[PDB]
Symmetry: D2
Subunit: 196 residues, 4 copies
Amino acid sequence: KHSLPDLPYDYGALEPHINAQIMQLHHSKHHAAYVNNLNVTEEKYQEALAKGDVTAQIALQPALKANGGGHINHSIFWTNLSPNGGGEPKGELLEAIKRDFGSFDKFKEKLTAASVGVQGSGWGWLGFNKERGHLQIAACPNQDPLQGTTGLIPLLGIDVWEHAYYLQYKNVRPDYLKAIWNVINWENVTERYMAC
Amino acid sequence: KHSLPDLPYDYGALEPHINAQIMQLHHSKHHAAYVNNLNVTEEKYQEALAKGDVTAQIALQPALKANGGGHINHSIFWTNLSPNGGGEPKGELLEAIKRDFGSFDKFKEKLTAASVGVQGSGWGWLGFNKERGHLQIAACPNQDPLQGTTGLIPLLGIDVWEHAYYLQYKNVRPDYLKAIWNVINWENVTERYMAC
Amino acid sequence: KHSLPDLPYDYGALEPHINAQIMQLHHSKHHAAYVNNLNVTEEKYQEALAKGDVTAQIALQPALKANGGGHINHSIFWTNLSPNGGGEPKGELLEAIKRDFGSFDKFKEKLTAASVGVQGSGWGWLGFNKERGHLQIAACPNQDPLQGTTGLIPLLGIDVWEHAYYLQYKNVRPDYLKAIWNVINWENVTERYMAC
Amino acid sequence: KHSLPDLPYDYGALEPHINAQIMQLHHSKHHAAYVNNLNVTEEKYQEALAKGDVTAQIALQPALKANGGGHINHSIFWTNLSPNGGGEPKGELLEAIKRDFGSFDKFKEKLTAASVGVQGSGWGWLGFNKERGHLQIAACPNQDPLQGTTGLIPLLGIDVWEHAYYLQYKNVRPDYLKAIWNVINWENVTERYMAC
Ligand SMILES: [Mn+2]
Ligand SMILES: [Mn+2]
Ligand SMILES: [Mn+2]
Ligand SMILES: [Mn+2]
């Protein structure tokens, strides 16, 4: 009941910031595997739940989180990028950013730092805290999804698993983060922000 | 669809090793809460699963593990104790213990050490590793169940959450562990061992 | 080089909200053990560090965190309580609370919820986020200290390990939390707040 | 006081199983960073320890584990590989493997499964359990070192962070694991085994 979403653009549309080979592998191999594994896991959980097998439900948690999170995270990621992206946001989002981070540049700095600081695999996120009513930066390990594990509503995510940049930027994660700002789809981030 | 099991003996049957007040609170308050919370959580999960809400499924994992594990762990614990317990096991179990731990006393020592070493709340377990075909000692945090999180089949469990001994032994966990050996139901442990 | 601090009041000074037996055990047994274990652990770390034994340094991390955190957490806790406490804070602290939580009652509600929600052993905290310049509520597991693990400056802490309330309130954690508000030393919380 | 070890062979010595570009980046960039970060972290810890700053000691734990583990893990990894490796072990090691895993092929299968199953970044290990006196397979997340976190003595490690294989094998981790068996230095694994 979960499917791989089509990319809203061509695999080479984000060049030269993110090359076509990475986009193709990331989408058709990595994301595809997560969706397929997610469907298999949910079916097993339905069976475990149906017979009240608590042990089986708990044993399946890691797989569900990794694959469920993998699907969620990448689905949002594709919409966060655009060949027509880059620049700075405008309107309320920009004001919210100035209000919570001081300036757009300080925000970029904070999110970049959080993303580069991830030890191992993970994601850097700009999220919305509905309880406090303000923007918040958070980093999640592996495929742990933002909302499901922290309660924050995801607005913008940056994948820092090595498969997201290694072929092009190798070990230099900072170079990858510097380039991704040129393809951020602020129109989508704004939409997500307005929704909450 | 999950219910609180009746105790196979009277609340004061384990005196003076574990007093009646602890047994009554442990069973009718602590275990009861876990069962009730477990049923509420599974119902929510059925709904989340039915509409493919992955975020909701992941957000419910901690509650399901804590309450599901709470029910599983305590259910086994009650069967591991008996007013007619104590002493040493016999037959194959005893041989398996001598074979994997050297002697019964060394086994007691190892399980005691693992149980007293738990920082915070948790359980000490004597489990069976089906893959290796031998006995194994493990400690689990909070209510994380043995089988669901490690794959080991539970044979004997020792609850070291403070509510399991504080009223009677206060901060002296070692005194609690020394006394519990007098009420271990080796007949039940043997049954669980033979089953796998 | 670490020592057990003397209590700023008599063990029975917080009656009837927290009885003397709990205060005596909590301070002279629980806190004392953490201090002694902390000193032993730091000495071992000095030796490991001196010979560049990285493996030994890493193996000692859990003990240092549990005992180091145990000492830190309880030291702050004793100063957070007072036989002359209770009521509501005043001045800037009160304003900060109204500003970040809406009202004092909503704040109490939020901190209570965070404290009762801890699965297993842990602490509920009212802390200060120096980066954002606002108050924040957080819950830490076992003895993990607030500042050392989250970066937040601790202002008020509530111990929810079962040994902190079981003898008097048994399994009813909510009753314990309701009573502790009568002995909060707002003068100390204010001091900690003004310092940062 | 920690230094980057020289590789016991040329960067292209493991071709075609592991290409020269990966070996060069892995050693001169990845491992080098860990060593440098480790030295900086230990110096900070010496200062924290000297003034009894427990908070600072705890805040530094993640960095020490990641960088300390990074150095330890890679140092062992380089010695586990050889242009003259491959094939099967002999002598006592082979017997121990047959005894604990059934056969060499079953062992390869078990270690491969553990390595491919790592979600995110991590390592697959063949270790020795001194307490039980037998071989054991374990998987560690990120740079968490084997001995420091599990107590097992490391004999053979397989790096499954994506930087260890992505440039050559892309997303196909199984292809990487199949190829690495051709360059395992069984002479070194045997030495480590005999030492314990
Ligand atoms: Mn990715
Ligand atoms: Mn219990
Ligand atoms: Mn305490
Ligand atoms: Mn590596």
